[PDB]
Amino acid sequence: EIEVTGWEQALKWLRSNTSKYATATSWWDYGYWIESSLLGNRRRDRDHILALFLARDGNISEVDFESWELNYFIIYLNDWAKFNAISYLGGAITRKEYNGDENGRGRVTTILLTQAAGNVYVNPYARIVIKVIQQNKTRRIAVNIGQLECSPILSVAFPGNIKIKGSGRCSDGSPFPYVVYLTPSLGVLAYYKVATSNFVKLAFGIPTSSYSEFAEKLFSNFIPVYQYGSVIVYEFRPFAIYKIEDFINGTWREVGKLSPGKHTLRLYISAFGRDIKNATLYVYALNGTKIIKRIKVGEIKYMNHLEEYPIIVNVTLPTAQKYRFILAQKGPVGVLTGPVRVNGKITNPAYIMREGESGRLELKVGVDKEYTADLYLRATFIYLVRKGGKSNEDYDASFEPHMDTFFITKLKEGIKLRPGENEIVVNAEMPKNAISSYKEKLEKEHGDKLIIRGIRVEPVFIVEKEYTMIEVSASAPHHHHHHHHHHH
Numbered sequence: 166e167i168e169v170t171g172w173e174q175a176l177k178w179l180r181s182n183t184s185k186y187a188t189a190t191s192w193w194d195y196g197y198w199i200e201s202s203l204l205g206n207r208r209r210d211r212d213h214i215l216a217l218f219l220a221r222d223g224n225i226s227e228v229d230f231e232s233w234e235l236n237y238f239i240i241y242l243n244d245w246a247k248f249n250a251i252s253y254l255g256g257a258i259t260r261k262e263y264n265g266d267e268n269g270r271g272r273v274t275t276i277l278l279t280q281a282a283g284n285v286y287v288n289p290y291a292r293i294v295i296k297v298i299q300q301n302k303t304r305r306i307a308v309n310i311g312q313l314e315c316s317p318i319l320s321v322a323f324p325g326n327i328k329i330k331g332s333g334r335c336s337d338g339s340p341f342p343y344v345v346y347l348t349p350s351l352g353v354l355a356y357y358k359v360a361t362s363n364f365v366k367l368a369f370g371i372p373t374s375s376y377s378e379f380a381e382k383l384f385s386n387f388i389p390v391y392q393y394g395s396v397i398v399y400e401f402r403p404f405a406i407y408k409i410e411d412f413i414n415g416t417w418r419e420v421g422k423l424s425p426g427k428h429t430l431r432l433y434i435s436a437f438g439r440d441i442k443n444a445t446l447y448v449y450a451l452n453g454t455k456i457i458k459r460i461k462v463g464e465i466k467y468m469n470h471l472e473e474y475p476i477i478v479n480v481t482l483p484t485a486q487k488y489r490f491i492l493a494q495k496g497p498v499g500v501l502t503g504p505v506r507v508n509g510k511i512t513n514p515a516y517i518m519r520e521g522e523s524g525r526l527e528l529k530v531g532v533d534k535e536y537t538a539d540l541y542l543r544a545t546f547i548y549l550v551r552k553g554g555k556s557n558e559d560y561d562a563s564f565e566p567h568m569d570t571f572f573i574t575k576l577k578e579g580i581k582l583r584p585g586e587n588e589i590v591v592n593a594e595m596p597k598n599a600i601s602s603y604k605e606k607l608e609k610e611h612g613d614k615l616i617i618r619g620i621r622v623e624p625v626f627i628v629e630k631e632y633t634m635i636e637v638s639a640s641a642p643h644h645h646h647h648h649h650h651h652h653h
């Protein structure tokens with residue numbers, strides 16, 4: 166029997182259900198041979214940022230995917246096999262842990278999977294058997310790896326969230342710094358530094374985080390829209406609502422569906438990687454795919470994406486099949502649909518111009534709807550900052566990735582974009598020192614601890630953009646159906 170990975174089905178899905186201007190990304194380069202007119206994103210500086218997302222948890226894992234115009238993020242269960250690399254590249258583990266020190270010793274297995282085989286979990290190839298033992302009025306998890314038995318730091322069974330401590334030691338006496346997650350069909354064995362990583366959450370639906378509320382927020386930013394085999398396609402919503410409360414007969418109640426009529430709602434907002442600024446809230450009433458009313462319900466001048474707070478609104482919802490909550494604010498749209506030229510010449514679309522340069526810049530960009538855009542030149546620095554070790558060459562070093570973006574210069578106000586391809590022509594001036602200036606700043610701040618991994622200079626179209634925060638089904642509005650005998 167063939168092993169279906171899920172990839173063939175997932176790409177087919179993406180091709181049939183998403184805009185031709187949508188951006189998908191992934192760890193693995195499946196699909197590299199697919200031909201497009203698109204010079205945009207369908208998936209090595211960005212590797213550190215992908216890994217930063219996947220290998221980490223909480224605040225530091227909040228990467229600004231919006232600046233990439235990211236639409237879909239593909240999670241592949243088989244990436245456990247690449248997880249040391251991802252952990253290393255994302256700053257979760259040291260070089261030593263990643264693949265051994267200079268004597269090939271000390272390497273760590275970040276993620277191992279076991280298959281449920283009734284009451285017990287196995288991986289033949291790794292010679293692993295995980296089982297629950299009952300001894301001394303109590304439960305414990307035993308991980309057997311060859312002849313030695315091992316006690317995980319912590320184990321958590323799902324469904325349940327049933328926590329159960331252990332020693333973090335083997336019968337050997339030797340350390341066992343692993344966490345176990347038991348699900349109905351998988352047993353995940355994770356090294357402690359990556360036990361609550363986002364990959365573990367999204368690959369295996371484990372709702373754990375070292376941080377309070379973080380798993381719940383994450384799941385509103387990444388919506389499973391399709392799955393097959395070992396592939397889950399998540400839609401990215403940078404601004405999302407993870408919990409709504411209706412104020413009902415004097416107390417707040419968590420709600421699923423909403424009835425038409427007046428409501429007072431408390432919206433719990435998760436902002437992922439970027440702040441809310443000068444934002445308007447809406448509700449769009451929808452019948453199927455038709456939008457029948459747009460209602461402004463609020464504004465948010467500013468919310469910090471690391472310290473978000475609930476928002477109270479009052480709304481009269483008309484009758485409709487479902488309600489879509491929208492956040493509108495400034496952000497990027499447009500995918501490059503042909504090559505980019507400076508002064509007649511084809512240039513790199515990731516490095517449009519060097520500091521000091523000048524000239525006619527020619528872009529062709531595709532958008533899904535009409536907008537009025539401003540065009541900027543935007544810089545992106547992806548770099549590493551050594552944490553630990555006494556040198557970039559020391560094996561006890563880990564490297565923490567960073568991504569800073571800033572707008573270098575505005576090139577044009579009030580471009581009218583049209584659904585489909587748009588040809589754009591403008592005069593462009595790179596200030597000398599735009600890049601070097603920032604490079605020096607980082608150098609001065611971090612010293613030898615700094616490794617720059619990528620610098621980009623990119624054209625970016627800024628518009629009032631609509632973001633989908635959540636979709637809520639309407640409830641039936643009342644309240645025998647013999648009315649239809651001998652009808653039609």
Ligand SMILES: [Ca+2]
Binds near residue numbers: 227436438470471472
């Ligand atoms: Ca956040």
Ligand SMILES: [Cl-]
Binds near residue numbers: 570625
């Ligand atoms: Cl941006």
